[PDB]
Amino acid sequence: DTICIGYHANNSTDTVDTVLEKNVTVTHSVNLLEDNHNGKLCKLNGIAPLQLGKCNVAGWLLGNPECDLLLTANSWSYIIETSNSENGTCYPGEFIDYEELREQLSSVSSFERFEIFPKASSWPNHETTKGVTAACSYFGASSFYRNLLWITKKGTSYPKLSKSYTNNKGKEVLVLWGVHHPPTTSEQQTLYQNTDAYVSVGSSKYNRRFTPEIAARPKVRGQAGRMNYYWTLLDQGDTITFEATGNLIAPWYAFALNKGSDSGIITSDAPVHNCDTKCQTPHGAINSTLPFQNVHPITIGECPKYVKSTKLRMATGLRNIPSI
Amino acid sequence: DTICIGYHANNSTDTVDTVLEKNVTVTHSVNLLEDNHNGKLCKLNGIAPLQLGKCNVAGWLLGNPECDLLLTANSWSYIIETSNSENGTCYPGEFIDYEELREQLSSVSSFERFEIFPKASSWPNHETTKGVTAACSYFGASSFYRNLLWITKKGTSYPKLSKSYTNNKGKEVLVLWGVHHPPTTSEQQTLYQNTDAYVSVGSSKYNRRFTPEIAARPKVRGQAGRMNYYWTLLDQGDTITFEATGNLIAPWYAFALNKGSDSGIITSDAPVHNCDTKCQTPHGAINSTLPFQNVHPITIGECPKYVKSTKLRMATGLRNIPSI
Amino acid sequence: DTICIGYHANNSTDTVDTVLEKNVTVTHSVNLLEDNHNGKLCKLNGIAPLQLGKCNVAGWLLGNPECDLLLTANSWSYIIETSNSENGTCYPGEFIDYEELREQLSSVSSFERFEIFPKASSWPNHETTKGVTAACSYFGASSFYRNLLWITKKGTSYPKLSKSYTNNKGKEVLVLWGVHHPPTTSEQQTLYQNTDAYVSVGSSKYNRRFTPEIAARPKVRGQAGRMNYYWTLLDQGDTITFEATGNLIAPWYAFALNKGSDSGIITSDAPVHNCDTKCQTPHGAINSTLPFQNVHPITIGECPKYVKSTKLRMATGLRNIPSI
Amino acid sequence: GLFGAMAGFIEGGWTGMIDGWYGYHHQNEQGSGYAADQKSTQNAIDGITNKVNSIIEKMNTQFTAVGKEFNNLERRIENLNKKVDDGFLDVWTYNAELLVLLENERTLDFHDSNVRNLYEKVKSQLRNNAKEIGNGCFEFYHKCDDECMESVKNGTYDYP
Amino acid sequence: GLFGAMAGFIEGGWTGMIDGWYGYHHQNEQGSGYAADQKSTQNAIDGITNKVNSIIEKMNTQFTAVGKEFNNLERRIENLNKKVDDGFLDVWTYNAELLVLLENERTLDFHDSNVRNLYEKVKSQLRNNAKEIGNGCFEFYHKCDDECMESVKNGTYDYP
Amino acid sequence: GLFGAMAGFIEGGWTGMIDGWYGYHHQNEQGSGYAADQKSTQNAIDGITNKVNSIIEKMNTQFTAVGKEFNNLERRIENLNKKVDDGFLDVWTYNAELLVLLENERTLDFHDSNVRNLYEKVKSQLRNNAKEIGNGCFEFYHKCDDECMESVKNGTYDYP
Numbered sequence A, B, C: 001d002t003i004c005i006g007y008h009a010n011n012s013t014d015t016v017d018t019v020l021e022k023n024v025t026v027t028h029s030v031n032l033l034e035d036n037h038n039g040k041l042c043k044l045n046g047i048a049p050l051q052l053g054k055c056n057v058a059g060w061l062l063g064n065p066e067c068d069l070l071l072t073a074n075s076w077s078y079i080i081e082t083s084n085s086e087n088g089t090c091y092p093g094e095f096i097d098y099e100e101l102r103e104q105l106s107s108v109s110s111f112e113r114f115e116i117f118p119k120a121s122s123w124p125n126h127e128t129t130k131g132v133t134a135a136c137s138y139f140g141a142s143s144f145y146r147n148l149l150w151i152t153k154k155g156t157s158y159p160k161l162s163k164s165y166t167n168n169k170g171k172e173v174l175v176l177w178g179v180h181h182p183p184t185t186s187e188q189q190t191l192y193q194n195t196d197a198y199v200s201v202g203s204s205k206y207n208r209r210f211t212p213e214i215a216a217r218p219k220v221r222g223q224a225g226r227m228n229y230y231w232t233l234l235d236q237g238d239t240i241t242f243e244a245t246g247n248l249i250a251p252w253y254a255f256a257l258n259k260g261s262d263s264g265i266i267t268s269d270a271p272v273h274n275c276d277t278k279c280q281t282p283h284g285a286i287n288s289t290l291p292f293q294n295v296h297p298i299t300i301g302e303c304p305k306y307v308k309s310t311k312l313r314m315a316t317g318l319r320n321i322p323s324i
Numbered sequence D, E, F: 001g002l003f004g005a006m007a008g009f010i011e012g013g014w015t016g017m018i019d020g021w022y023g024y025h026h027q028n029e030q031g032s033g034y035a036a037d038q039k040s041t042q043n044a045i046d047g048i049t050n051k052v053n054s055i056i057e058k059m060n061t062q063f064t065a066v067g068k069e070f071n072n073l074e075r076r077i078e079n080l081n082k083k084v085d086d087g088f089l090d091v092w093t094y095n096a097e098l099l100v101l102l103e104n105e106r107t108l109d110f111h112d113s114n115v116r117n118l119y120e121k122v123k124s125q126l127r128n129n130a131k132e133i134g135n136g137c138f139e140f141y142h143k144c145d146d147e148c149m150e151s152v153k154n155g156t157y158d159y160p
C-alpha cells in the first residue's frame, strides 16, 4: 500500500523562456503577442473608412477630374490612399499646409459638399469659361478641378472682383482656393491684364494678401505656370471675403464638414471589406485583446503596443515531463 | 506545556492586490498614489505665480486698458490665466508667435517695465494724440493699449519716422510693436497718407520689413481693420531700429526682463494662497513624496508621474487573518 | 565521521543592492552600467566623421575664407564642431532653415563639390570682380565666400540676368545662394541700379521670388547690410532657374551629394583618432555591450539607454561570508 | 525547481493524471489510479488565471494614430517623431520581453511550490505510519484501503 | 502561501501578539502569553522599510511643465505632443500597476517565508523533545517552565 | 535567506571550497576537505549566465542621434524634445535601478535555494544513519570512509 503526490503532464510541445533557461516545454501556455491580421481594411468603430484609390487627398478635395467617384464622400473614420494614389494637383504648384489639412480631415462625422460661389452666377464682368488646362485632362479633353474655378480676363478687361461667403451652415466650412503664378510678366497680363494684380482673403481669422510671383521655371506635367492651393476652416457665423484684380483661382465648391476627433491616413492596397475593428493597420485589422503586437508600428485606434519581438508566450501550466 | 510560532493580526481592513489574488486584507499597507490636492494655486519653489484674472497673456503685455493692475507684475514662477481671461488684443489682429512668447515668458526672475519710446517726446512731425479706438474702451471712453502708441498722420502729412533704441539695461528687453492693416486703400491714406507705406524693424538679429496688407474683411468686435502684434528679445548692447512711412503701432513701453529657465501657464479658477510646493497643478498643489499621481496630467515642477490608476496600495505588513 | 554541505566564499568586496538590503558583499558580480569612454572622437561604423575646427557648418558650406581645408570634405558619418567653430557667415544675415540643413547633411555617402555657375564665363553684362567685403577678410585682404559669387552692377547698368542649371549628376545637388539686403534705398542703386530689383528661383519644387528689404539696422562685424542665405536640394533631372534684376548672391559652386540616412552633429574638443565604434558621444566613444550608460545624454548610433544612475551592479555569485 | 519538487525529488510528471495539475496516485491491494487534488488545482488555476488577466487587462490604450507625415523641410521634427516611436517601441520591447521571462520563472516556481506543499501536507499526516521513498511517494507501514486512501487525500488521516 | 505557513499549516493570525509580526505563544503550568520574535520582526521591518524607500526614492523627476499650447495650424505637432504624453502616461500606468501587483506578491511571500523559517528554527532545537501538532505548535514531551520557554525563544534550547 | 540557508542555518561560507558555488566538506578518519557539488554548481552557472545574457541581450537599440538643434523661435518644440528625452531618460533610470534591485534579490534567493535543496538532498539519503547538527552538517552514526563519502556526494548512498 502506497500513495504518491505528483504533477500533471501531457503531449504539449509549447515552449516558453525563463530568465534561467531557454525553451522550456510546458503543459499549457498563453500567447500575449498579436502577430496575425485579417489582411483587410475594416471599419474603425462602426464607421467605414474613405477610399481614394487612384486619387490622393489633394486630388480628392481640389476636385481633380480623375476623382469623380469621390464627389459623394460621406462620414468616414479614416482615409485610405493606395500605391496608385497619384491623381492630385494635376496642375503644378504647392498645396500650402497640405500635411496639416490631411491630418485635420482624417476623421469627419458630417461632411456635405455645397456650391459656395456658383460658377454661372457669380464673377460677372469676368471670364469663367476658358479656365481649363491640358494638365487636368478629362477624357482627352482639357479640363480643370471641379471645386475651384479659373477666373480669367473678360475680353481685354479684368476689373476688380469682390465676393464674400458667410457660413450659415451651422458647422465648419472648408474653403479651398488657389493663386496662379505665371512664369512671365507677359502672361500675367494676357490672362489677368493688371500686371500688379493681387488677391486677398479676409475673415475674422485670416488676412493674408497675395500677389502673383512671376518667375521663369521648369515645365511640370505640362505648364511652366504654378498654382498654390490654400485652405481655411471658416467658423460658424464668420464671413470670408475674396477680392482680387487677378490671379485668383476662386472657390466654386466648398465643404460643410463636421469633424469631432482625429485619426489618420492608412496607405495600403489591402481590400476594404465590411468588417469592424478597434485597431486597424496597413496590412489588415489587429485584435485588441492582447497587450502587444508586431504586425506593424503604424496603427490607428486602441491598439496593442507595438514591439520588435516575435515570441511572447507566457506559461500557465507547468513543466511538461511525461513518459510513462 | 506547549509553544507555538505564529504571526500578527489586527483590525486593519486595508486591502491590496497581488498577481494571484485581488483584494487581500493586510495588517499594514502604504499608499504610493498621490490622489488629493489642496485646491489652491501655491507658490512654486519660493516664488509666487502671476495672476492675470480677466486679462490674458496678450492683454497683459500689450497694455490692454482692462489690465491696469498687471502693470506692476514682478518676479513670478508661473503664469495663471482663469476662465475669465478674455481681455487681450481688444483691437483685432494676429499676435505673431504668441504661443511661443507665452512659453518663453512663463518664468521670469527680474522684469521691469520701462518707457522705451516716450510718447510726449519722440514722434515729432507725427500725430500721437488721436491713436485711440472704441475697440479698446476704458470706462466707456475710447482708449488703446498702454505699451504701444498709435502714430497717425500729422495734419495732411505723414513723413518718414526713424527712431532707434539701444539696450543698455544689462539684460534682455522684450520689445513689442504692431503693424496696422486698414481694410481699404482709402483708409490707408486718410491715416498714414503714403499709400505705399511700410515699416521696418532692424537689429543685429532681425530684419523683416512690413507693408500694409489692405483687404476687405469682417468687422471684429468693432473694426474691419486689423493689427498684427510683433515682439522680439533685444540682446544686451544690441540696437533695434524702427522706421516707417506709416502703419506702425510703435513701442511706447518695453520690458527689461531677466528670465533664467522656463515653466508654463496654469489655467484655473482655484484660489491663489501663500503656500508653497515643488509640484503645482490646475486643481491645486500636489505632494512630491510619492512616485505616482492621478490628480492631473498637466503639471509644473518636479511631479510624480501621472497615471490613470485610482489605487496603488503597497503591502508592508502581512495577510490579516484575525478572529480569536 | 561527518559531512557538511555549504557554500563558496572569497576575498571579493563587490557590493550590490537588493530591495531588502543595501550594499551586500557578493562573491561575483557583473556591471551593467557603461560609465567610461575613450575620450576620443572615433569613426562611427567604418566611416570617419567630418571635422570643421574653427569653421562651423554654415561657414563650411558657404565657402567662408577661413575654411579652405574643408574644401575637400568627402564621405563622413557625422559632423564635428568645436568650441572654436566660429568662422561661419562672415557677412551678416540669416541662414534660412539652417538647423534643418545641418540635420539633413549630418551623414553623407558621396559628396562632390562642382562649379555650377562658373564665375569667369557666366554673368555677362554684369560685374563679377568687385564682389568682396572686409567682413570676409582673407589674410588681411577683403574677400568673400568661395561657393557664392557677389554679382554687382556693370558700370552704370545692371540688366536682367537669367541663368539655369539642370542636375545631370545622377544624385541630389545642394544649391546654396543668397539675397543681399542694403540698409538704404540709396545703396540698392549704387550696387544693383534698379531700385525695384528682385530675385527669383524656379524649380519643379521651388518658386519663391525675393525682393530686397532695405531698412536701417545695426552694423554687424562690419556692415549694416545683410545677406540671407538660402539652399535647396535639386532632384536628379530637375532644372533650377535663377533670374534677377539685382541683389542676387549667385551660386558659384554647388555640391553633388549622396546622402542615405541621417546622423547628427557632435560638438566637442576631444581628439579625433582612427578608432571605430557603434556608439559615439561628445566625450568619447562608448561600448555598446551593456544595456545602460551614464557617459552622456546626447549620443549617436546604437547606444545603451542613458540613465541618471551611477551604479547598476548585478549579482551573479552569492553573499560573501568568509572568515576561516 | 526553486522548491525542488518538479524535476527535483519528484522528477517527471503523470500523463495518467488527467483531472488536474497536482494530485496523487495510490496503490493498495484493491487497485490503483490517479486523482488530482481538487483544491490546490482549482486555486492554482484561479491565481494563474488572475495573473494572466492582470498582465492583459492592466494594459491601458488611448485611441491614437501613430503615423505623422512631415515634408522635406520638417526633417527635424520628423526625426523627433521617429525618436518618440522608436523610443516607446523600445521600452515595450524590453518590458514585454522581460515581463514574460521573469513571470514565466515565477509561474513555474509557483507550481513547484504547490507540489512541495502538497507533498509536505501528506508527509505531515502520515508521519510514522509510512516510509518516505525519496521519489514523491509514501509506503504505509500499515494497510490503507480506499477509505483510508481517500482519508489522506481529503486531509482527514487518522492517528499518526 | 508560497511557503505554506500563512493561511497554510499555520492558518489564522494572532490578535493577541501586539509587539511584532512573527512570534510565539507558549502555554505551560505557570501561565501563557504572546511574544513577538524581536529579531526576525525587526529585520522584516528594515527590509520592507528599505523596499518601500527604494520604490519611492528611485523615482527620478526633472523639473518640467507638461502642457504645450499649439495653434490651429500646428495640429500635427500637437498630436505628436499628445502621443508623447499618452505615451509616458501609459508606460507609468502599466508599470505602477504591475510593480505593485508583483511586489505585493513578493512581500506576502516574504512574511510567509519568515514565519516558516521561524517555525523551522524551533522545530530544529526541540526535535524529539516535543511533538509537532500540525498547526504551528510544539508540545514538549517534558516540562518547560518559563526559563525553558525563554530558552527556546532566544535560540538556546538544551539537549534535544 | 528566503530559504534560510545562507547566513541562516548554514551561516558563513567556505574560503576553502574553491571549485564551485555549493558543495561539501567531509571529515572522516582518513582525512578531510572541500568539494563543490559539480552539477548544482554548473547549473546555477548556466542559469545566472542565461539571466545576465537575457537582461543584456533583450535590450533593443535603434541607430539614432539624440540631439536636435532648435532656434529661438522653436522653444516650444525644443521643450517638447526636452520632455521626450527626460521622459525616456527617466523611464530607463527607474527601470535599470529597480530591475537590478529586484533581480539581485532573486539571484541571492536562487543560490540560497540551491544550498537548501542540496542540504535537503543529503539529509534525504542519510536519514537515520546520521544526526543533524543544525549548522549544515551531518554526523554519520556509522563509519563513512572515502568511498562512502563519495557515495553520498554522487547521490548513491546505501541503506538508510
Ligand SMILES: CC(=O)N[C@@H]1[C@@H](O[C@@H]2O[C@H](CO)[C@H](O)[C@H](O[C@]3(C(=O)O)C[C@H](O)[C@@H](NC(C)=O)[C@H]([C@H](O)[C@H](O)CO)O3)[C@H]2O)[C@H](O)[C@@H](CO)O[C@H]1O
Pocket (backbone or CB within 6 Å): A130, A131, A132, A133, A134, A135, A142, A152, A181, A182, A183, A187, A191, A222, A223, A224, A225, A226
Ligand atoms: C502644341 C503645344 O504645345 N502648344 C503650343 C502653345 O503652347 C502654349 O503655351 C502656353 C504658355 O504660354 C500654355 O502652356 C498653353 O497651355 C495652356 C494649358 O494650361 O493647357 C492652355 C490653356 O488654355 C491655358 N489656360 C487658360 C488660362 O485658359 C494655360 C494657361 O495659359 C497657363 O497654364 C498659364 O500659366 O496654358 C500652351 O498651349 C503655343 O502657345 C502655340 C503658339 O502658337 O503653339 C502651340 O503648338
Ligand SMILES: CC(=O)N[C@@H]1[C@@H](O[C@@H]2O[C@H](CO)[C@H](O)[C@H](O[C@]3(C(=O)O)C[C@H](O)[C@@H](NC(C)=O)[C@H]([C@H](O)[C@H](O)CO)O3)[C@H]2O)[C@H](O)[C@@H](CO)O[C@H]1O
Pocket (backbone or CB within 6 Å): B130, B131, B132, B133, B134, B135, B142, B152, B181, B182, B183, B187, B191, B222, B223, B224, B225, B226
Ligand atoms: C456710429 C458709428 O458706428 N460710427 C460711424 C462712423 O464709423 C467709423 O468707421 C471707421 C471705418 O472707416 C472706423 O471704424 C471708426 O472707428 C474708429 C475706431 O477704431 O473706433 C474710430 C477711431 O478714432 C479710429 N482710430 C484712429 C485712426 O484715430 C479707428 C481707425 O480709423 C480704424 O480702426 C482704422 O482701421 O476707427 C468708426 O467710427 C462713420 O465713419 C461715420 C460717418 O459719418 O458715421 C458714424 O455713425
Ligand SMILES: CC(=O)N[C@@H]1[C@@H](O[C@@H]2O[C@H](CO)[C@H](O)[C@H](O[C@]3(C(=O)O)C[C@H](O)[C@@H](NC(C)=O)[C@H]([C@H](O)[C@H](O)CO)O3)[C@H]2O)[C@H](O)[C@@H](CO)O[C@H]1O
Pocket (backbone or CB within 6 Å): C130, C131, C132, C133, C134, C135, C142, C152, C181, C182, C183, C187, C191, C222, C223, C224, C225, C226
Ligand atoms: C574706413 C571705413 O570705415 N570706410 C569708410 C567707407 O565706408 C564704407 O561704407 C559702406 C556703406 O555704405 C560699406 O560698408 C563699405 O564697406 C564695404 C564692405 O563690405 O567691406 C566695401 C565693399 O567693397 C562693398 N562691397 C561691394 C558691393 O563691392 C560693401 C558693400 O557695399 C556693402 O556691404 C553693401 O551692403 O561695403 C565701407 O568701406 C566710406 O564709404 C568712405 C567715404 O569716403 O570713408 C571710409 O573711411
Ligand SMILES: *[C@H]1O[C@H](CO)[C@@H](O[C@H]2O[C@H](CO)[C@@H](O)[C@H](O)[C@H]2NC(C)=O)[C@H](O)[C@H]1NC(C)=O
Pocket (backbone or CB within 6 Å): A064, A065, A066, A084, A085, A086, A087, A088, A089, A090, A135, A136, A137, A138
Ligand atoms: C492623374 O494621375 C495619373 C497617373 O497616376 C496621370 O497619368 C500619368 O501616368 C501616365 C501613364 O499612366 C504617364 O504618361 C504620365 O506620367 C501621367 N500623365 C499621363 C500622360 O497620363 C494622369 O494624367 C493624372 N490625371 C489628372 C487629371 O490628375
Ligand SMILES: *[C@H]1O[C@H](CO)[C@@H](O[C@H]2O[C@H](CO)[C@@H](O)[C@H](O)[C@H]2NC(C)=O)[C@H](O)[C@H]1NC(C)=O
Pocket (backbone or CB within 6 Å): B064, B065, B066, B084, B085, B086, B087, B088, B089, B090, B135, B136, B137, B138
Ligand atoms: C475685455 O474682455 C471683455 C470680456 O471678457 C470685453 O467685454 C465683452 O463682454 C461683454 C459682456 O461682458 C460683451 O458685450 C462683448 O462680447 C465684449 N465687449 C463688451 C461690449 O463689453 C471687453 O470689452 C474687453 N475690453 C478690452 C478693452 O479688451
Ligand SMILES: *[C@H]1O[C@H](CO)[C@@H](O[C@H]2O[C@H](CO)[C@@H](O)[C@H](O)[C@H]2NC(C)=O)[C@H](O)[C@H]1NC(C)=O
Pocket (backbone or CB within 6 Å): C064, C065, C066, C084, C085, C086, C087, C088, C089, C090, C135, C136, C137, C138
Ligand atoms: C571667423 O571667426 C573668427 C573668430 O572665431 C573671426 O575673428 C573674430 O575674433 C577676433 C579675435 O580672434 C575678434 O577681433 C573679432 O571678434 C573677430 N574678427 C576679427 C577682427 O578677427 C574672423 O574674423 C572670422 N573670419 C571669417 C572670414 O569669417
Ligand SMILES: *[C@@H]1O[C@H](CO)[C@@H](O)[C@H](O)[C@H]1NC(C)=O
Pocket (backbone or CB within 6 Å): A011, A012
Ligand atoms: C494531444 O492529446 C490530446 C488528449 O486528448 C488529444 O486530444 C490531441 O489530439 C493530442 N494532440 C497532439 C499534440 O498530439
Ligand SMILES: *[C@@H]1O[C@H](CO)[C@@H](O)[C@H](O)[C@H]1NC(C)=O
Pocket (backbone or CB within 6 Å): A015, A022, A023
Ligand atoms: C529552442 O531551442 C533553441 C534555443 O535554445 C532555438 O534555436 C530553437 O529555435 C527554439 N525552438 C523553439 C521551441 O521555439
Ligand SMILES: *[C@@H]1O[C@H](CO)[C@@H](O)[C@H](O)[C@H]1NC(C)=O
Pocket (backbone or CB within 6 Å): B011, B012
Ligand atoms: C483598530 O485597533 C486599534 C488598536 O488600538 C485602535 O486604536 C483603533 O481605534 C481600531 N480602529 C478600527 C479600525 O476599528
Ligand SMILES: *[C@@H]1O[C@H](CO)[C@@H](O)[C@H](O)[C@H]1NC(C)=O
Pocket (backbone or CB within 6 Å): B015, B022, B023
Ligand atoms: C474588492 O472586491 C472586488 C474585487 O474582487 C471589488 O469589486 C471591490 O470593489 C474591492 N473592494 C476593495 C477592497 O477596494
Ligand SMILES: *[C@@H]1O[C@H](CO)[C@@H](O)[C@H](O)[C@H]1NC(C)=O
Pocket (backbone or CB within 6 Å): C011, C012
Ligand atoms: C583575491 O584572491 C585571489 C585568489 O587567488 C587572488 O588571485 C587575488 O590577488 C586576491 N585579490 C584581492 C582582492 O585581495
Ligand SMILES: *[C@@H]1O[C@H](CO)[C@@H](O)[C@H](O)[C@H]1NC(C)=O
Pocket (backbone or CB within 6 Å): C015, C022, C023
Ligand atoms: C554602502 O554603504 C552605504 C549604504 O548603506 C553607503 O554610504 C556607502 O557608500 C556604500 N558603499 C559601497 C559598497 O559602495
